[PDB]
Design an enzyme around this catalytic site. Structure first.
Site, PDB file in Angstrom:
ATOM      1  N   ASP A 285       5.294  -0.798  -0.871  1.00 34.11           N
ATOM      2  CA  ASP A 285       4.650  -0.048   0.176  1.00 34.11           C
ATOM      3  C   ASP A 285       5.680   0.062   1.295  1.00 34.11           C
ATOM      4  O   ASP A 285       6.758  -0.532   1.227  1.00 34.11           O
ATOM      5  CB  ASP A 285       3.397  -0.764   0.675  1.00 34.11           C
ATOM      6  CG  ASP A 285       2.348   0.204   1.213  1.00 34.11           C
ATOM      7  OD1 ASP A 285       2.708   1.173   1.919  1.00 34.11           O
ATOM      8  OD2 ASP A 285       1.151  -0.012   0.936  1.00 34.11           O
ATOM      9  N   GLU A 491      -5.889   2.571   8.341  1.00 42.38           N
ATOM     10  CA  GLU A 491      -5.377   1.220   8.204  1.00 42.38           C
ATOM     11  C   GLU A 491      -5.724   0.335   9.414  1.00 42.38           C
ATOM     12  O   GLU A 491      -6.734   0.544  10.080  1.00 42.38           O
ATOM     13  CB  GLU A 491      -3.864   1.280   7.979  1.00 42.38           C
ATOM     14  CG  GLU A 491      -3.507   2.004   6.688  1.00 42.38           C
ATOM     15  CD  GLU A 491      -2.013   2.098   6.447  1.00 42.38           C
ATOM     16  OE1 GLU A 491      -1.321   1.060   6.558  1.00 42.38           O
ATOM     17  OE2 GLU A 491      -1.532   3.207   6.136  1.00 42.38           O
TER      18      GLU A 491
HETATM   19  O1  LIG Z   1       2.052   6.789   3.819  1.00 42.70           O
HETATM   20  C1  LIG Z   1       2.685   5.994   2.777  1.00 42.70           C
HETATM   21  C2  LIG Z   1       1.958   4.615   2.548  1.00 42.70           C
HETATM   22  C3  LIG Z   1       0.530   4.684   1.992  1.00 42.70           C
HETATM   23  O2  LIG Z   1       0.553   5.395   0.722  1.00 42.70           O
HETATM   24  C4  LIG Z   1      -0.046   3.241   1.768  1.00 42.70           C
HETATM   25  O3  LIG Z   1      -1.347   3.265   1.263  1.00 42.70           O
HETATM   26  C5  LIG Z   1      -0.107   2.439   3.095  1.00 42.70           C
HETATM   27  O4  LIG Z   1      -0.025   1.032   2.851  1.00 42.70           O
HETATM   28  C6  LIG Z   1       0.963   2.859   4.074  1.00 42.70           C
HETATM   29  N1  LIG Z   1       1.163   2.355   5.291  1.00 42.70           N
HETATM   30  C7  LIG Z   1       2.231   3.004   5.893  1.00 42.70           C
HETATM   31  C8  LIG Z   1       2.762   2.712   7.288  1.00 42.70           C
HETATM   32  C9  LIG Z   1       2.184   1.661   8.062  1.00 42.70           C
HETATM   33  C10 LIG Z   1       2.700   1.368   9.356  1.00 42.70           C
HETATM   34  C11 LIG Z   1       3.780   2.123   9.868  1.00 42.70           C
HETATM   35  C12 LIG Z   1       4.351   3.165   9.103  1.00 42.70           C
HETATM   36  C13 LIG Z   1       3.844   3.456   7.817  1.00 42.70           C
HETATM   37  C14 LIG Z   1       2.665   3.917   4.988  1.00 42.70           C
HETATM   38  N2  LIG Z   1       1.882   3.832   3.843  1.00 42.70           N
END
Ligand SMILES: OC[C@@H]1[C@@H](O)[C@H](O)[C@@H](O)c2nc(-c3ccccc3)cn21
Ligand SMILES: *[C@@H]1O[C@H](CO)[C@@H](O[C@@H]2O[C@H](CO)[C@@H](O[C@H]3O[C@H](CO[C@H]4O[C@H](CO)[C@@H](O)[C@H](O)[C@@H]4O[C@@H]4O[C@H](CO)[C@@H](O)[C@H](O)[C@H]4NC(C)=O)[C@@H](O)[C@H](O)[C@@H]3O)[C@H](O)[C@H]2NC(C)=O)[C@H](O[C@@H]2O[C@@H](C)[C@@H](O)[C@@H](O)[C@@H]2O)[C@H]1NC(C)=O
Ligand SMILES: *[C@@H]1O[C@H](CO)[C@@H](O[C@@H]2O[C@H](CO)[C@@H](O[C@@H]3O[C@H](CO)[C@@H](O)[C@H](O)[C@@H]3O)[C@H](O)[C@H]2NC(C)=O)[C@H](O[C@@H]2O[C@@H](C)[C@@H](O)[C@@H](O)[C@@H]2O)[C@H]1NC(C)=O
Ligand SMILES: *[C@@H]1O[C@H](CO)[C@@H](O)[C@H](O)[C@H]1NC(C)=O
Length: 602
Positions: A285, A491
Site C-alpha cells: 500500500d 480512511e
Molecule cells: O490511493 C491508493 C491507495 C488505496 O488503493 C488504498 O486502499 C489505501 O490504503 C491508500 N491510502 C493512501 C494514502 C494515505 C495517506 C496519504 C497518501 C495516500 C493511498 N492508498
C-alpha cells in the site's frame, strides 16, 4: 534470433520464463517498483526500468481532464517504458472503487455499503463491467478493487467501502471481480490471475487481511483476534477471489495480533501464496512498508527487507523510488534477500502482464473514450442507487397513512437539507478528490435536480437548504423532502467515535417535519445515531452514499419502483454498544441486519 517472450502465440508461462531469463537485476527490481505519476518522467521511467505507475486519490493530469487527456498521459508514460532494452510495458493502476471515480464526468456508482443492501451480486457484476469500460476509456488497465474488508465497527472511516459486516455477503459480492476482469474459463485453476483483454482491467482484492477488524475501528490499527475468527470472518472472500481469478492483492496497513501485515510472511507467503495458491502478484500500500516501523520510514532499510521477504511482489513507494531501488539493490547484492525472491516477485508481476495481454495492447484505444459517463452506465448506477436505499420508517405511527410513495402532482412541495443539492455529498469519499469534495465536482444529478425532473409540471418545487419552522408552516406545502447526513471522508480522516451527523441536520429535519409531513433522506457511509431523526420524521430512508445519479433516490420516493433494499449492517442504538454484530451475545440492535421496510410501484 527468435525472441519467445515477444511472440503472442506462445503460452503465458513460457513467455514469462523467457523474458525473466534475459533480465538483469536493475530490470527485475524495476518491475517491482510502482510510483505516483507525480514523480514520473520519461527519463525516470526508462532509466529506472519502472514496471508500474499509479494515481493516488485526486492525482489527475488536469482538473476537469477529458478521457483523451488521460489516455494521452498514460500513453506518454508507456511510450517511455516501451523504449527500455527489453520493452516491458508498465501497468497503470488507479482507485476505481465505485466507477472511475477520479475522472471528471465519470459515472459515480453507490459505494460498497450501499451495494450490499441490494443483495444483488449480479447488479454488482454489471457495475464491474461498467467500471471496466470507463477505466479503460481513460487508458488505465488496473483498478485497485474490490475492497473485500468486512467492516466490524462502523466507527471505522472506511466502513462504506465494505459491502457488509457479514462475510457471507462480502463473498457473494466478489462478483465485481469477474465483472472487472471478465469471466474465467471453465478449466481455470483457483488462484491463477486473469483478465479477458483490452476491454477489461486487472482487479485488486484489498486489503489482505482483516482491515475491517481493527480495535475501535481505528484506521490501519491492530486487529486482535484468534486465527479461527480471522479465518472465518475476514479471510473467506479472498478464497472466493481466488476462484474468480483476481489478478492482484494489496496488503493492509493494519496488523494482526500485533504483527504488521506487510511483514507477515506466514499470511502473505505461507497462507495466501502457498495455501490459497495465489499466482497473481501482491502489491503493498502507499508507503505501507514504511509504516511497518514506528515512526514510519524510521528505517526504510528494514521495511524493504521485512516486506520483500514477507512475500510482497510489488511496492507502491510511491515517491522516493530512488531510495527503494538503491536499498533493495543493496540487499540483493548482499545476499540478505535471495534472488529466488526477486525472481518470484517478477515472475508474478510478468505473468499478470502477459495474461492481460499488456504486451499486445500496451497503448490506449481512442475508440474507448466514448465509454466515459455513458448514459447506459448512469442508468445502471441509477438502478443500483434505487436498489440500495433501505426504508427504515414510513409512517409516524402504525395507523398513519404510509407517506411513501409521494404523489408526483401537488400544489407546492419543499425540498431542503444540506445534502439535498450537493453532488459531492451524495457521492462521498473517493470522488474526484481523495477525500471527496463538496458541491458540483462532476457530471451528475443531485436529489433536488432529480425531484424537479420527476414531479408533474404543475408541481411547484421550492428549495431551502436550511429553513426555519416559521418558513415551513407558512409555505403552503403538501409535503417536504429533507436530505442530510455525513460529509465526504476517506480512511483515517473519517474514523468517528461519536457517529452523529454534523449540524445543521437534525435541526433542519426537526424544523421542516414539524411544519409539514416529511420524508427524510439520510446520506451517510454507515449507520449513525438515528433515533432523533426517526423521531421527527414520518418516513426515513437510508441512502448511504448513492453516487452521481440522484434520480435513483426519487425513483423510490415517488413509487416508480418500490423499496427492496435491506440493511447490510447492524444499526446500533448508541455507539457504546460497539462493536456489536449479528451473532454476538449482547446483540441489542436498533435495526438488525436484513431490516428493510418496503413499498410497491406504479
Ligand atoms: O490511493 C491508493 C491507495 C488505496 O488503493 C488504498 O486502499 C489505501 O490504503 C491508500 N491510502 C493512501 C494514502 C494515505 C495517506 C496519504 C497518501 C495516500 C493511498 N492508498
Ligand atoms: C464526531 O467526531 C468527528 C470526527 O471524529 C467530528 O468531526 C470533525 O470535527 C472536526 C472539528 O472538531 C473537523 O475539523 C477539521 O476540519 C475543519 C473543517 O471541517 C469542514 O471541512 C471538512 C473538509 O474540508 C469536512 O470534512 C468537515 O465535515 C467540515 O465540513 C463543513 O461542515 C460545516 C458544518 O457541518 C458545513 O457548514 C460546511 O458546508 C462543510 N464544508 C464542507 C467543505 O464540507 C477544519 O477547519 C479543522 O482545522 C480540521 O481540519 C473535522 O473536519 C470533522 N470531520 C471530519 C470528517 O474531518 C464531529 O464534530 C462535529 O461535526 C463536524 C462536522 C463539525 O461540524 C464539528 O464542529 C462538530 O463538533 C464529532 N461530532 C460530535 C457531535 O462531537
Ligand atoms: C410488492 O412489494 C413486495 C416487496 O417485498 C414484493 O414481494 C417481494 O418480492 C421479492 C421479489 O422481488 C420476493 O423475493 C425475494 O426478494 C428479495 C428482496 O430482498 C430479492 O432480493 C430476492 O432475489 C427474492 O426474489 C420477496 O420475498 C417478496 N416479499 C414478500 C413478503 O413476499 C411484491 O412482489 C410480488 O409478491 C412477492 C411475494 C413475489 O411473488 C414477487 O415475485 C411478486 O411480484 C411486490 N408486488 C409487485 C407487483 O411487485
Ligand atoms: C493503534 O492506534 C494507537 C492510537 O492511535 C497507537 O498508539 C498504536 O501505536 C496503534 N497500534 C497499531 C498496531 O496500529
Amino acid at each position: 534470433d527468435y525472441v519467445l517472450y515477444k511472440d503472442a502465440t506462445k503460452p503465458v508461462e513460457d513467455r514469462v520464463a523467457d523474458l525473466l531469463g534475459r533480465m538483469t537485476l536493475a530490470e527485475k527490481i524495476g518491475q517491482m517498483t510502482q510510483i505516483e505519476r507525480l514523480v514520473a518522467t520519461p527519463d525516470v521511467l526508462r532509466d529506472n526500468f519502472i514496471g508500474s505507475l499509479l494515481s493516488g486519490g485526486g492525482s489527475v493530469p488536469r482538473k476537469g481532464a477529458t478521457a483523451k487527456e488521460w489516455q494521452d498521459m498514460v500513453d506518454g508514460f508507456q511510450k517511455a517504458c516501451m523504449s527500455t532494452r527489453l520493452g516491458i510495458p508498465m501497468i497503470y493502476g488507479i482507485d476505481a472503487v465505485h466507477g472511475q471515480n477520479n475522472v471528471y464526468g465519470a459515472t459515480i456508482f453507490p459505494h460498497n455499503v450501499g451495494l450490499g443492501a441490494t443483495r444483488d451480486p449480479y447488479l454488482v457484476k454489471r457495475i464491474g463491467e461498467a467500471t471496466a469500460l470507463e477505466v479503460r476509456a481513460t487508458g488505465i488497465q488496473y483498478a485497485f478493487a474490490p475492497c473485500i474488508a468486512v467492516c466490524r465497527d462502523p466507527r471505522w472511516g472506511r466502513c462504506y467501502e465494505s459491502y457488509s459486516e457479514d462475510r457471507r455477503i462480502v463473498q457473494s459480492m466478489t462478483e465485481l471481480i469477474p465483472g472487472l476482469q471478465g469471466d474465467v474459463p471453465k478449466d481455470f485453476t483457483s488462484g491463477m490471475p486473469f483478465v479477458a483483454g483490452k476491454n477489461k482491467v486487472a482487479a485488486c482484492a484489498k486489503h489482505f487481511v482483516g482491515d475491517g477488524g481493527t480495535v475501535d475501528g481505528i484506521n490501519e490499527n491492530n486487529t486482535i483476534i484468534n486465527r479461527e475468527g480471522l479465518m472465518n470472518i475476514h479471510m473467506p472472500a479472498y478464497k472466493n477471489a481466488m476462484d474468480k481469478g483476481v489478478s492482484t492483492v494489496m496488503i493492509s496497513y493494519s496488523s494482526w495480533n500485533g504483527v504488521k501485515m506487510h511483514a507477515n510472511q506466514d499470511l502473505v507467503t505461507g497462507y495466501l501464496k502457498d495455501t490459497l495458491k495465489f499466482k497473481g502478484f501482491v502489491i503493498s500500500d502507499w508507503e505501507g512498508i514504511d509504516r511497518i516501523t514506528t515512526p514510519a520510514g524510521s528505517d526504510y532499510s528494514y521495511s524493504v527487507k521485512a516486506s520483500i521477504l514477507a512475500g510482497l511482489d510489488m511496492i507502491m513507494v510511491p515517491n522516493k523510488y530512488q531510495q527503494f531501488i538503491s536499498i533493495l539493490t543493496g540487499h540483493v547484492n548482499g545476499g540478505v534477500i535471495p534472488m529466488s525472491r526477486i525472481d518470484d516477485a517478477v515472475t508474478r508481476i510478468l505473468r499478470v502482464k502477459f495474461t492481460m495481454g499488456l504486451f499486445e495492447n500496451p497503448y490506449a484505444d481512442p475508440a474507448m473514450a466514448e465509454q466515459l459517463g455513458k448514459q447506459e452506465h448512469r442508468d445502471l448506477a441509477r438502478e443500483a442507487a434505487r436498489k440500495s436505499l433501505v426504508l427504515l420508517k414510513n409512517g409516524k405511527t402504525s395507523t398513519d397513512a404510509p407517506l411513501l410513495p409521494l404523489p408526483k402532482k401537488a400544489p407546492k412541495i419543499l425540498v431542503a437539507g444540506s445534502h439535498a443539492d450537493n453532488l459531492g455529498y451524495q457521492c462521498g469519499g473517493w470522488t474526484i478528490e481523495w477525500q471527496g469534495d463538496t458541491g458540483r465536482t462532476t457530471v451528475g444529478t443531485t436529489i433536488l435536480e432529480a425531484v424537479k425532473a420527476a414531479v408533474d409540471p404543475s408541481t411547484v418545487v421550492v428549495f431551502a437548504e436550511n429553513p426555519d419552522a416559521e418558513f415551513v408552516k407558512s409555505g403552503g406545502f403538501s409535503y417536504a423532502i429533507v436530505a442530510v447526513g455525513e460529509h465526504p471522508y476517506t480512511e483515517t480522516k473519517g474514523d468517528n467515535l461519536n457517529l452523529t451527523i454534523p449540524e445543521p441536520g437534525l435541526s433542519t429535519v426537526q424544523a421542516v417535519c414539524g411544519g409539514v409531513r416529511c420524508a427524510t433522506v439520510l446520506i451517510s457511509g454507515r449507520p449513525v445515531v438515528v433515533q432523533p431523526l426517526l423521531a421527527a420524521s414520518d418516513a426515513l430512508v437510508a441512502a448511504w452514499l448513492p453516487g452521481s445519479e440522484g434520480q435513483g433516490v426519487t425513483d423510490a420516493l415517488f413509487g416508480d419502483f418500490g423499496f427492496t433494499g435491506r440493511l447490510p449492517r447492524t444499526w446500533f442504538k448508541s455507539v457504546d454498544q460497539l462493536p456489536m454484530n449479528v451473532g454476538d451475545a449482547h446483540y441489542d440492535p436498533l435495526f438488525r441486519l436484513g431490516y428493510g421496510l418496503t413499498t410497491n410501484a406504479t
